[PDB]
């Protein structure tokens, strides 16, 4: 039972260094909370089963790019927990990390064993549902903003339009509430990209990152989607774009 997306946004309050998507919050690890390596592949295969199955029902049983995205981000989230590279750990996702420790060992080399095991298993686990963690979350946040933009602008066009030689954004009570409601969205989206983009730089710079196809937080959305413009994205998120001036500015 995965709640419909855009019913919960990325929460930057729990960990203020990085914002966590709600999809990762609802990641089903329940069996991982209960040689051992082959014993661990089974417990993880159930969680990889339920998860990939529920996300499809969340997708209205449809086969489309949106579904393959939800499987992909959910797949990599598993690796970050199994490798110990997960930045989400809060509540019982800390418990999974501690469970895998006594299973994989805590030794200095044992951090290297986790990667090897997830290197072979990943080709399997992927089928059971049907790159650094921050790099993936910029791909997911990017797909959020592009499908959340036309809705907010649409809800605004209904309540604010027409010269009724001045705009409805002054003297019309319903429109002035609609404009502030837009402010909340574009504010959260701005404060989000603030936190998340720094986590991209604090990783790429502090850890050796061999992927040079993305040197900037902008480059992720540039390779993820087509009609993305670097300039326009800056204006929209700063509320200076040629829309939010024509709606919500009375002068």
């Amino acid at each position, epitope marked *: 039972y995965k709640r419909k997306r855009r019913e919960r946004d990325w929460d930057c309050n729990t960990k203020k260094d990085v914002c966590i998507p709600d999809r990762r919050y609802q990641l089903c690890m329940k069996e991982l909370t209960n040689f051992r390596k082959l014993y661990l592949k089974r417990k993880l295969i159930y969680d990889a089963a339920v998860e990939g199955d529920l996300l499809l029902k969340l997708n209205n049983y449809r086969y489309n790019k949106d579904f393959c995205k939800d499987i992909r981000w959910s797949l990599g989230d598993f690796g970050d927990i199994i490798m110990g590279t997960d930045m989400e750990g809060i509540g019982y996702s800390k418990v999974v990390e501690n469970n895998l420790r006594s299973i994989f060992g805590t030794d200095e080399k044992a951090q290297q064993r986790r990667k090897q095991w997830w290197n072979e298993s990943k080709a399997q686990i992927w089928t059971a549902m049907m790159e650094p963690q921050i790099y993936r979350w910029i791909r997911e946040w990017g797909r959020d903003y592009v499908s959340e933009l036309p809705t907010e602008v649409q809800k605004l066009k209904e309540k604010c339009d027409g010269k009724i030689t001045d705009k409805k954004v002054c003297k019309v009570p319903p429109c002035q509430n609609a404009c*502030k409601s837009y402010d909340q969205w574009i504010t959260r989206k701005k404060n989000q990209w603030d936190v998340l983009s720094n986590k991209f730089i604090s990783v790429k710079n502090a850890e050796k990152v061999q992927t040079a196809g993305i040197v900037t937080p902008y480059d992720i959305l540039k390779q993820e989607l087509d009609e993305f413009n670097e300039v326009a994205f800056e204006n929209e998120i700063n509320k200076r774009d040629g829309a939010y001036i024509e709606l919500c500015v009375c002068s």
Partner: single-chain antibody
Amino acid sequence: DIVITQDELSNPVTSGESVSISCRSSKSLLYQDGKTYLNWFLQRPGQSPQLLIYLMSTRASGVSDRFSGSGSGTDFTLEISRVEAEDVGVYYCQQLVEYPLTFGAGTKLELKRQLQQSGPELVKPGASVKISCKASGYAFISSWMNWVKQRPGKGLEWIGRIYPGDGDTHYNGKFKGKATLTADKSSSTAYMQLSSLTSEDSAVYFCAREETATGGFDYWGQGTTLTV
């Protein structure tokens, strides 16, 4: 200036006897989005206003399911089914089509058988006394603080509203010069300083938090008694 008027309840209402209060505007309360903007409140005999029904039929959370919001968009009606002794009081409507926000005269009812507002204030004529409204919620920066003027034995007069986030102000034309609407952010406190007092100004004043997302006035204060 939009006209609003309500009817009077002629006979004392027996408990459980149903009833319907009717509201009539002078203008279509529908909007460009095809939504009828309207509200229905109830003031307990001794309490602050409480929202019941908003956006025509849509019910307010916490309000009993037996209050109906029907309307044709210039003609609206509430409905009290199996009326309760708690509901005895005065009911008001609100219309959002354009400023000023106008609350109707109100309809009586018979029994047949939060926000921190500043304390009372008594000052000479021609004075100015700021009064506060303290909202503990962090929505104070994201909400609309509305101010309301309750004269003794009278309906509601909307003074204006201020949004602490961008510091916007909407002023009722009547009070255009008599109101000073500020807001404290750091302590999340709203302030209203009335200009040089006239004897007419003696009345209780209420603040109403409006969610920027719904837009109903759910949260009201204990009141502020002002005396000349």
